[PDB]
């Protein structure tokens, strides 16, 4: 007799390209029963200025893969790779030439500019040549939203009518997942078929790939639709879980805790309203699940917050077609993925979670309400949002702005402060806990100060950081950036920042720059901003393969951790 396997490439086994079949720019050196240790891989850069990628490989990984993991390959290229190890106390080395094949975009139509998304390197300081960024983005399907949850007909419903829709099953799009180096090169591709099939009508293979977050094992969590996953940089799918039967539409975030639980953002399916109508609620529930997929805890935001507060909601850009125009709420808006008040409408739009291990409490970003900390006791602990709209007892949880001296800062109910840089955040994203123990937010900025400005381009996003005295109920703004970069730095939606303590930078990714330039690719701008000087250390730009097709997130990933 039959066909033999690949024969050994060097002093170990065969060198297999894309072993798990989901990551075509990876490869594996088969152990072939060799007992090695002290392993190190080096993928050599392409061209004169190509980037080298180098990393150690720990014993768990050798055992898991039964071989040496090769991450960092270029596509359709005779990659040169070097593996060093120790075998029998002798230092060993092999050099491999590893051909790869092509990256494929399986979702293309007449909107397609070309098959892959374009990179434009803009700025790369000295000492930042090694950086790698994983880009969480997507590409439109030819058919667009084609499926709906079926809901419950309301008493307002016509008699001959068919039942309605509910939840957000249309929140569904092809993934575009890759790592880019500082030369604008693809160094990693997650096969679109790994989790998604938009040609099939298998809802298990549908949704919006999101909330990709590293774990303590050097791996990543993710959510797509009605499932949550774990996977590594070799393209191995480590977990695949259906959501617990009460729940639906997991989007935006998934982060692992120190306790080995995972926090998910979902909705509640067949949620019984007070008027006795059932709906799939919209982005207003939080799950804590274990690695069995079981439900450790649940946070029902419809009973913690105020689903009737429309302070920010009514002040929104409809475009996020009818772009620019401020959002006019109506009382009879049908339930579903729509701007509105109450359960079964998009009242909350939680888009980010952070676990606070010090006090066993989650921190949350509600695009449409503000930022909050809720205890394990399901009690709100503090709020960070403009005073407008809130009633008690919530109103008393609002934080109070103060300066570096601790003296209060005077702002109105719309968030407009006086004689200060201090400002809140609006339609914000990733409200996380920096390594510093502070809170980093990406203040997208739509509906800032609870109004639309005289002109669409008058808008702007910030990186911004806050110091919060939970004891005193005060909040100090301690760092911002981007307020002065204009509409070319304004992302209305998605996006992220993250403090990088290793090089004292503030990482960021603006995911929808120029979303509203009808007919132009959308811009995903990768940034590392110097924390001390605000010097731009890295700037790189991703451009959508279709016009007006937003990006979601990016991560700063480190090979030294990818393979424990």
Footprint of a copy of itself (CB under 8 A):
2, 5, 19, 30-33, 60-61, 63-66, 150, 162-163, 217, 219, 230, 238-240, 244-247, 260, 270-272, 290-298
How far apart are the two ends of the chain, measured CA to CA in Å? Answer: 40
Residue whose structure tokens are 């979902």: 266
Closest CA to 462 of 521, 515, 422: 422
Cβ-based nearer residue to ligand MUX, 100 or 444: 444
Cβ-based nearer residue to ligand MUX, 100 or 494: 494
| Residue 214 · residue 153 · CB < 8 Å | no
Q: Does 351 bind ligand MUX (CB under 6 A)?
A: yes
Q: Out of ligand MUX, a copy of itself, none, which partner does residue 293 contact, by CB within 5 to 8 A per kind?
A: a copy of itself
Q: Does 429 bind ligand MUX (CB under 6 A)?
A: yes
Cβ-based nearer residue to a copy of itself, 245 or 322: 245
Q: How far is the CB of 314 from ligand MUX (least distance, A)?
A: 17
Closest CA to 482 of 444, 524, 522, 431: 444
Closest CA to 106 of 148, 135, 75, 138: 138
Q: How far is the CB of 252 from ligand MUX (least distance, A)?
A: 5
| Residue 461 · residue 442 · CB < 8 Å | yes
Cβ-based nearer residue to a copy of itself, 268 or 397: 268
245 CB contacts (<8 Å, ≥6 apart)? 269
Cβ-based nearer residue to ligand MUX, 24 or 307: 307
Q: Does 514 bind ligand MUX (CB under 6 A)?
A: no
Our measurement of the distance from residue 284's CA atom to the centroid of its chain's CA atoms, rounded to an integer in Å, reads 17
Q: Out of ligand MUX, a copy of itself, none, which partner does residue 64 contact, by CB within 5 to 8 A per kind?
A: a copy of itself
Residue 359's Cβ-count burial label (10 Å; 0-12, 13-18, 19+) is exposed
Cβ-based nearer residue to a copy of itself, 124 or 362: 362
Closest CA to 23 of 233, 239, 238, 240: 233
DSSP labels, 99-154: E----------TT-SSSS-EEEEEEE-TT-TT-EEEEEEEE--SS-S---EE----
Q: Out of a copy of itself, ligand MUX, none, which partner does residue 240 contact, by CB within 5 to 8 A per kind?
A: a copy of itself
Q: Out of ligand MUX, a copy of itself, none, which partner does residue 238 contact, by CB within 5 to 8 A per kind?
A: a copy of itself
Q: Out of ligand MUX, a copy of itself, none, which partner does residue 351 contact, by CB within 5 to 8 A per kind?
A: ligand MUX
Three-state secondary-structure class, residue 62: helix
| Element (DSSP H or E) covering residue 59 | helix 59-65
Q: How far apart are CA 313 and CA 116, in angstroms?
A: 36
| Element (DSSP H or E) covering residue 528 | strand 521-530
Q: Does 100 bind ligand MUX (CB under 6 A)?
A: no
Q: How far apart are CA 231 and CA 523, in angstroms?
A: 27
Q: How far is the CB of 277 from ligand MUX (least distance, A)?
A: 26
Q: Which of 367, 448, 525, 537 binds ligand MUX (CB under 6 A)?
A: 367
Q: Does 494 bind ligand MUX (CB under 6 A)?
A: yes
Sheet holding 67-71, edge to edge: 15-17, 26-30, 67-71
Q: Out of a copy of itself, ligand MUX, none, which partner does residue 76 contact, by CB within 5 to 8 A per kind?
A: none
9: tokens are 């490439």
Q: How far apart are CA 112 and CA 543, in angstroms?
A: 12
Q: How far is the CB of 493 from ligand MUX (least distance, A)?
A: 4
Q: Which of 320, 383, 450, 523 binds ligand MUX (CB under 6 A)?
A: 320
Cβ-based nearer residue to a copy of itself, 67 or 370: 67
Q: What x-and-dash track marks residues 122-151 binding ligand MUX by CB under 6 A?
A: ------------------------------
Q: Out of ligand MUX, a copy of itself, none, which partner does residue 32 contact, by CB within 5 to 8 A per kind?
A: a copy of itself
Could you tell me which residues are beta bridge partners of residue 382? 373
Q: What x-and-dash track marks residues 232-271 binding ligand MUX by CB under 6 A?
A: --------------------x-------------------
E-strand stretches of 434-473: 439-443, 462-469
Q: Out of ligand MUX, a copy of itself, none, which partner does residue 329 contact, by CB within 5 to 8 A per kind?
A: none
Q: Out of a copy of itself, ligand MUX, none, which partner does residue 400 contact, by CB within 5 to 8 A per kind?
A: none
- 314-333 burial, b for 16+ CB within 10 Å, e for fewer? bbbbebbeeeeeebeeeeee
Cβ-based nearer residue to a copy of itself, 215 or 444: 215
Q: Does 493 bind ligand MUX (CB under 6 A)?
A: yes
Q: Out of ligand MUX, a copy of itself, none, which partner does residue 320 contact, by CB within 5 to 8 A per kind?
A: ligand MUX
Q: How far is the CB of 509 from ligand MUX (least distance, A)?
A: 11
Provide the binding-site residues for ligand MUX, judged by CB under 6 A: 252, 320, 349, 351, 367, 429, 493-494, 550
């Amino acid at each position: 007799a039959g066909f033999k396997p690949a024969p050994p490439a060097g002093q170990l086994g065969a060198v297999i390209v894309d072993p798990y079949g989901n990551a075509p720019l990876t490869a594996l050196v088969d152990l072939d029963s060799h007992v090695i240790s002290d392993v190190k891989v080096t993928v050599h850069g392409k061209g004169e200025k190509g980037v080298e990628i180098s990393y150690p490989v720990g014993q768990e990984s050798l055992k898991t893969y039964d071989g040496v993991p090769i991450f960092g390959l270029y596509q359709k290229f005779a990659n040169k790779v070097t593996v060093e190890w120790k075998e029998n106390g002798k230092v060993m080395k092999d050099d491999y030439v590893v051909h790869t094949s092509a990256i494929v975009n399986n979702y293309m139509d007449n909107r397609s500019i070309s098959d892959l998304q374009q990179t434009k390197v803009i700025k790369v300081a000295p000492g930042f040549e090694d950086r790698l960024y994983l880009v969480n983005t997507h590409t439109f399907t030819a058919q667009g939203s084609d499926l709906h949850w079926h809901g419950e007909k309301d008493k307002n419903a016509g008699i001959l009518d068919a039942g309605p829709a509910t939840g957000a099953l249309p929140f569904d799009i092809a993934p575009f997942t890759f790592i880019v180096d500082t030369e604008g090169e693809y160094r990693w591709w997650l096969d679109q078929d790994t989790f998604y099939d938009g040609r099939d009508r298998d809802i298990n293979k549908r949704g919006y790939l999101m909330g990709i977050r590293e774990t303590p094992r050097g791996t990543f969590t993710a959510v797509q639709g009605q499932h949550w996953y774990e996977f590594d940089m070799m393209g191995q799918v480590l977990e695949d879980h259906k959501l617990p039967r009460g729940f639906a539409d997991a989007t935006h975030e998934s982060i692992e805790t120190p306790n080995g639980t995972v926090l998910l953002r979902v909705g509640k399916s067949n949620y019984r309203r007070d008027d006795g109508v059932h709906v799939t609620t919209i982005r207003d529930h939080i799950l804590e699940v274990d690695k069995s997929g079981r439900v450790v805890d649940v946070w029902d935001l419809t009973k913690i917050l105020d689903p009737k507060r429309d302070a920010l909601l009514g002040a929104l850009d409809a475009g996020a077609a009818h772009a620019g125009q401020q959002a006019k709420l109506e009382p009879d808006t049908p339930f579903g993925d729509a701007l509105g008040v109450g359960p079964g409408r998009n009242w909350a739009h939680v888009n980010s979670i952070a676990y606070d291990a010090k006090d066993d409490s989650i921190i949350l970003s509600s695009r449409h309400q503000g930022v909050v900390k809720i205890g394990r006791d399901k009690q709100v602990k503090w709020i960070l949002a403009p005073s407008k709209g809130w009633e008690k007892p919530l109103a008393s949880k609002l934080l109070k702005p103060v300066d570096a001296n601790g003296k209060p800062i005077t702002c109105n109910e719309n968030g407009l402060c006086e004689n200060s840089d201090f400002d809140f955040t609006y339609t914000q994203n990733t409200a996380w806990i920096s390594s510093k123990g502070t809170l980093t937010i990406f203040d997208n900025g739509d509906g800032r100060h609870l109004e639309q400005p005289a002109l669409p381009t008058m808008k702007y996003s910030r990186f911004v950081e806050y110091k919060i005295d939970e004891k005193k109920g005060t909040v100090q703004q301690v760092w911002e950036y981007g307020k002065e970069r204009g509409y070319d730095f304004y992302s209305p939606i998605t996006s992220i920042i993250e403090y990088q303590a290793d090089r004292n930078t503030m990482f960021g990714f603006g995911g929808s720059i120029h979303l509203f330039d009808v007919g132009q690719p959308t811009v995903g701008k990768l940034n590392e901003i110097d924390y001390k000087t605000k010097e731009v250390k890295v700037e790189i730009d991703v451009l959508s393969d279709k016009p007006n097709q937003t990006h979601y997130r990016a991560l700063l990933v480190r090979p030294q951790q990818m393979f424990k």
